[PDB]
């Protein structure tokens with residue numbers, strides 16, 4: 001806990017964008033820490049057939065163009081959610097477009113879907129997908145592929161379509177990002193009427209299943225190779241800033257469509273007075289410790305309103321396996337981190353896994369599967 005939070009004397013900051021860049025340069029070229037503990041068999045979760053050997057995982061903010069997803073994942077994580085990968089490459093907003101709020105343990109940011117392109121990112125999944133089995137054959141590093149629209153396409157439904165065409169076959173779970181505050185009216189695609197039109201279109205390009213056998217796990221890599229027969233569990237990442245009315249419209253359209261899961265909360269555009277740090281007034285959604293009750297309620301509301309029959313991967317201020325314990329108790333099968341690592345640091349994957357496992361030991365039940373949603377047994 002006390003690494004960077006104790007040692008934050010140096011002025012405003014060492015720039016977050018710059019830091020993340022030279023961090024990911026390290027991530028790209030090995031040059032990182034390493035988890036060794038193998039993770040207790042307690043912490044494994046079979047979210048709809050998907051074996052999450054650990055339920056802790058890196059969120060979609062980090063490895064934005066598949067620079068090093070397995071290397072973050074060998075560094076203690078269970079899964080790694082890969083960017084928001086827009087069809088055509090985007091530059092993003094003008095920098096400085098991202099800020100630490102040291103006091104508040106938070107990060108406001110307005111990057112705006114800065115992507116390399118499915119042109120660039122497909123090859124890198126073509127890379128990862130075939131060598132991920134090879135390198136050290138990990139109890140496969142479960143792999144999230146998150147996709148969106150470009151700044152100004154008329155039909156996002158097309159850019160999700162393209163997305164699912166290209167980079168679907170590698171994802172253990174695919175993710176439609178409809179939530180970022182930092183793309184023009186994208187969040188307003190979460191509507192009952194649109195959400196459906198997208199979700200159906202998106203599982204319609206999954207309905208492109210192609211044929212084979214017609215001219216150790218050495219070679220599971222062949223075919224469309226997602227630790228199984230391809231089909232990613234379809235997800236949609238939803239907002240934190242929503243009416244009970246709009247969380248119905250979602251939850252209804254979730255159970256209507258047979259959506260395989262929901263990722264609970266992107267960043268929040270709320271600014272709760274309590275934020276003391278003088279960067280509180282910058283635009284963009286804020287992550288981290290202010291997004292605690294926000295996210296954790298959003299898990300619980302979407303759990304119950306989906307009868308729990310839809311899966312939940314909650315992000316939003318998951319700092320310590322206690323926060324993970326509660327979000328697991330509120331509905332989450334697995335949980336995500338990003339802004340919690342910018343204060344904890346690389347070996348926070350190993351920390352949150354074990355903080356969770358001991359608070360399971362203390363709570364009584366071990367093996368999380370029993371644990372999920374526990375809050376909805378009265």
Ligand SMILES: Cc1cc2nc3c(=O)[nH]c(=O)nc-3n(C[C@H](O)[C@H](O)[C@H](O)COP(=O)(O)O)c2cc1C
Pocket residue numbers: 059060061062064083084098107108109111113146177237265266267286287288289291315316317318336337338339340
């Ligand atoms: C700089 C930054 C970039 C992000 N980029 C993305 C993104 O490209 N796609 C996405 O789905 N979420 C993105 N997020 C949201 C995170 O994935 C996550 O949902 C949010 O930060 C809450 O998690 P945390 O409080 O546990 O860090 C980003 C967050 C930050 C702070």
Ligand SMILES: CC(C)=CCC/C(C)=C\CC/C(C)=C/Cc1c(O)c2ccccc2oc1=O
Pocket residue numbers: 004014015016017019020022023100107342
């Ligand atoms: C300065 C440099 C070239 C590398 C620093 C990384 C390192 C070895 C240790 C941690 C030092 C540090 C202050 C990191 C800050 C950091 C961020 O502020 C940050 C902000 C947003 C997204 C990702 C980020 O990753 C970071 O490592």
Ligand SMILES: O=C(O)c1cc(=O)[nH]c(=O)[nH]1
Pocket residue numbers: 084109110111112113114177179180181182266267284285286
């Ligand atoms: O690209 C961004 O600016 C961005 C994407 C996202 O999903 N969430 C966020 O807070 N910012």
